[PDB]
Amino acid sequence: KKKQTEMIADHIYGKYDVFKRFKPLALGIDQDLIAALPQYDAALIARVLANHCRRPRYLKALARGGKRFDLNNRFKGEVTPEEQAIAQNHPFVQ
Amino acid sequence: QETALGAALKSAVQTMSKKKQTEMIADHIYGKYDVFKRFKPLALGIDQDLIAALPQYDAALIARVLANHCRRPRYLKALARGGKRFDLNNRFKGEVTPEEQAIAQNHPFVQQALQQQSAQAA
């Protein structure tokens, strides 16, 4: 498992810009990641995402706010005030 | 003794103090709205709903009370619990996303609060 996920992520941060550059991610990017990657498992694709969203860098991107982005780096929704404020007050961010 | 006009005059006068207006807003909100009293996940745009429903109070101090409320461990713990969000009328409106839920779940204040909550059960 861990050998694979380690490779799975490696591929994502390498293929998709939105993950490489830590932009707030579109709602439902899990379904899109699994759909776009049949080559992997649908819960270890999800695991790699869980890891990403807890990194201080992602929290900081949330605190910054603005639009969210889909796998093709297009605006799709945005960060809400409530989520932006929780990210800003977070122990990793303040 | 006291008139309706009299009571409203006294209230208006009291609202001139920022600290006093802030206590009044919180008491109003926790007293009137079950979604606040019970710390349910709040719908998108609740800030605007509160502002519209409370014209007797400054929008800025309303936002402040709201932001105080969402910073409380008990609120984060509610976000960690997840499920639906609720509007001012205690009706379903939207939900807590997996991302919001995971962030609240890993929040230090929740790690504490969840540990306390279960130690009060034991």
UniProtKB/TrEMBL annotation, chain A:
Residues 1-94 form the ProQ/FinO domain. This is ProQ/FinO domain-containing protein. GO terms for molecular function: RNA binding. Coiled coil: none annotated. Signal peptide: none annotated. Keywords: RNA-binding. The chain holds residues 20 to 113 of 141 of the full protein. It comes from the Bacteria.
